[PDB]
């Protein structure tokens, strides 16, 4: 069975807290801040993606090129295998050819 | 798992409702009922 007999506890959602009231602020800083900073350097995240868009194998090759040297052995092995599978898949397999 | 169906109970119990009066394991089970209920309709 998947259903539950009793209700769950009610989710409290404070729609007015720090980041929900502060959200999106300093995103047009480049536009109406005389172009001192672009929003790509503003975001918090990994180093192999700070204002970058890409699919699976693109991300994999990028992260091994950039942060691959710092990577653990097992992670880098799994990642090399991943790029190998993705290369051969995207290039050999599928429709439209 | 990120997305899982929860209303399976209801969406199958409607079929079982339509197949309540049948005989044998059809009225109880679903896959034995679906093949029969659509046939009945």
């Amino acid at each position: 069975i998947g259903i539950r007999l009793t209700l769950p506890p009610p989710k409290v959602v404070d729609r007015w807290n720090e980041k929900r009231a502060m959200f999106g602020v300093y995103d047009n800083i480049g536009i109406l801040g005389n172009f001192e900073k672009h929003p790509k350097e503003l975001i918090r995240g990994p180093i192999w993606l700070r204002g970058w868009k890409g699919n699976e194998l693109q991300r994999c090759i990028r992260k091994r090129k950039m942060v691959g040297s710092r990577m653990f052995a097992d992670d880098l092995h799994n990642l090399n295998k991943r790029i190998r599978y993705l290369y051969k898949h995207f290039n050999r397999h599928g429709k439209f050819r | 798992l990120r997305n899982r169906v929860t209303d399976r109970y209801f969406r199958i119990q409607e079929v079982l409702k339509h197949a309540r009066h049948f005989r044998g394991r059809k009225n109880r089970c679903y896959r034995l009922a679906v093949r029969t209920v659509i046939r009945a309709f």
Partner: peptide, 26 residues
């Protein structure tokens, strides 16, 4: 546990319907 409460609400309504059918009030 299967997250969500809409289905739990729907099933609570089913359950109370069954309960009233079983022991209906006067």
């Amino acid at each position: 546990v299967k997250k969500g409460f809409r289905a739990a609400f729907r099933f609570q309504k089913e359950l109370e319907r069954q309960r009233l059918l079983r022991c209906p009030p006067p």
